[PDB]
Design a protein around this ligand. Structure first.
Ligand code: SGV
Ligand code: K
Length: 538
């Protein structure tokens, strides 16, 4: 054993597990400013109910905490809470759970009666329950509450100390980010214009992955628009099955993307470096399902992926997966095809190999490639450790057909062949339906996709927290030192557009997840103004 490899992992493992890894002076770094400092944000902030009272996590909790100071509003908060529970109760007990809400919030004499719904809607919703139990029964009811809360309660909240406190939180959110903000750990993988390594916010202790983009390498390969495009894409998409962007900042030599940390490792590692090649169909099915949902979300914005291979699918602490490395994705102009000779050897669709125009098709070619590789333990057109000059592997993708073995079930064999059709016109999922045609394939007969997208399905494989499911730090491919490049001011503009600092919603989740919001979000005794919110004197 090499000690660089042992030490690198034990350090990463220690951080991953007092103070939850926070800094000693974290209460000073995240000290609220006096409200008198937040007048600029008070003007800039758009006064939108959905954003300030729901979408933004810390805003959501502060509005709820404000409504809980009034019995006349605490009921509405309890209704929206109960509706959420009803929306995740089993179809078996839906009918029952639907009766408590009605008998507890929707009766003239109920203890927590909410009156702003409408005597017509309560009855309209009352008949719906005798018809059939449905998780979307109270959709109109909960909406009627949002129509009332966004009126007077919202404007009363904007006048209260809780919204002032929100501005204070927003003042910290705006603070600049630098290399100081994080502490870097071992490298987890080579990719793109730099390397991916684990990092940790010093103030909060939350673990992330830092995808480094070396400045000298972007200029030398003219990948500037490609790096920027990756950043925007990661920002626009908000899917449970795609790496989420939390920060994007600049350093003297590189641009950095702070992404969700996936301690479970990539599927390429779980396919080849953990026992026999591939794994059981059960695992492939679950993963194929989540990948489908992740592709479905990327396709809603009409954005192709083109980069689907096992090393770009990752595993989190619980066993779920996310798609990573969106650097090859582009948003499509509606009704047009793109020419791009991009992709990985043995993972490019027949359309891309002929330098031919294509659309959303190459993604479903990749989905089939992954299902096959997970089950068979090898690429559909390349051996496990077989040396082929690119020219032939390419040929095989176009000319030769894949071969299946006893490892494949009838349904697994069927979904693969239907996803691995050379003619993109008659390829599964590439029809006008989109991912709907794929969700119905017999392969997904016991997979309740609606229940998967919610998160009520337990992953089949749970990674052990005290294991690093990755190659050792000294076995990671490295780059060659870039030479002859000098960073000019012409690129200072691109660096500025990229480095936009922290992303609001993820940042707020960081403060909530690490309990920083819990410990710091306090007020005076008896619910009085604390000094940082008192306008008489600091
Ligand atoms: N791009 C990313 O978000 C990530 C890439 N890797 C590793 O880097 C490899 C790709 O170079 C993958 O196979 C993983 O082992 C990651 N490992 C952990 N978390 C992440 N967010 C990533
Ligand atoms: K395996």
């Amino acid at each position: 054993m090499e000690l660089e490899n042992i030490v690198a992992n034990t350090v990463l493992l220690k951080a991953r597990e007092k103070r939850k890894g926070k800094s000693k002076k974290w209460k000073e770094i995240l000290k609220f400013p006096h409200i008198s400092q937040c007048e600029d944000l008070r003007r800039t902030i758009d006064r939108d109910y959905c954003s300030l009272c729901d979408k933004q996590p810390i805003g959501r909790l502060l509005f709820r905490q404000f409504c809980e100071t009034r019995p006349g509003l605490e009921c509405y908060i309890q209704f929206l809470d109960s509706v959420a529970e009803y929306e995740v109760t089993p179809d078996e007990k839906l009918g029952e759970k639907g009766k408590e809400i009605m008998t507890k919030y929707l009766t003239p004499k109920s203890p927590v009666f909410i009156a702003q719904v409408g005597q017509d809607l309560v009855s309209q919703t009352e008949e719906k329950l005798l018809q059939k139990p449905c998780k979307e029964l109270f959709s109109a009811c909960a909406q009627s509450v949002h129509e009332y809360l966004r009126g007077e309660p919202f404007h009363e909240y904007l006048d209260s100390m809780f919204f002032d406190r929100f501005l204070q939180w927003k003042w910290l959110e705006r603070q600049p980010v630098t290399k100081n903000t994080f502490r870097q750990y071992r490298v987890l993988g080579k990719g793109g214009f730099g390397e991916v390594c684990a990092c940790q916010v010093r103030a909060t202790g939350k673990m992330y992955a830092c995808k480094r983009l070396e400045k000298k390498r972007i200029k030398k390969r003219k990948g500037e628009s490609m790096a920027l495009n990756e950043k925007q894409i990661l920002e626009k998409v908000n899917s449970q099955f795609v790496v989420n962007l939390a920060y994007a900042y600049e350093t003297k030599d590189a641009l950095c993307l702070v992404l969700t940390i996936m301690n479970g490792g990539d599927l390429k590692f779980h396919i080849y470096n953990m026992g026999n090649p591939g794994f059981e169909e059960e695992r492939a099915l679950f993963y194929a399902a989540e990948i489908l949902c992740g592709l479905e979300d990327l396709h809603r914005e009409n954005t192709v992926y083109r980069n689907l291979k096992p090393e770009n699918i990752l595993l989190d602490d619980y066993g779920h997966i996310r798609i990573s490395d969106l650097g090859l994705a582009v948003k499509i102009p509606e009704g047009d095809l793109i020419r791009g000779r991009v992709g990985t050897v043995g993972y490019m669709a027949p359309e891309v190999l002929n330098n031919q125009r294509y659309g959303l098709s190459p993604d479903y070619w990749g989905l089939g490639c992954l299902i096959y590789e997970m089950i068979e333990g090898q690429s559909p057109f390349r051996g496990r450790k077989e040396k082929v000059k690119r020219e032939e592997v390419d040929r095989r993708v176009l000319e030769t057909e894949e071969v299946y073995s006893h490892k494949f079930s009838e349904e697994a064999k069927s979904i693969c062949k239907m996803l691995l059709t050379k003619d993109a016109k008659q390829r599964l999922g590439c029809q006008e339906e989109g991912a709907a045609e794929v969700k119905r394939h017999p392969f997904f007969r016991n997979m309740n996709f609606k229940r998967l997208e919610a998160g009520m399905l337990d992953p089949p494989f749970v990674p052990d927290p005290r294991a690093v499911y990755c190659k050792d730090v000294l076995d990671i491919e490295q780059f060659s030192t870039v030479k002859g490049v000098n960073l000019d001011h012409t690129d200072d503009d691109f660096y500025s557009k990229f480095s936009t600092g922290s992303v609001s919603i993820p940042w707020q989740n960081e403060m909530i997840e690490t309990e920083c919001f819990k410990e710091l979000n306090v007020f005076g005794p008896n619910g009085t103004l604390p000094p940082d919110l008192n306008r008489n004197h600091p």
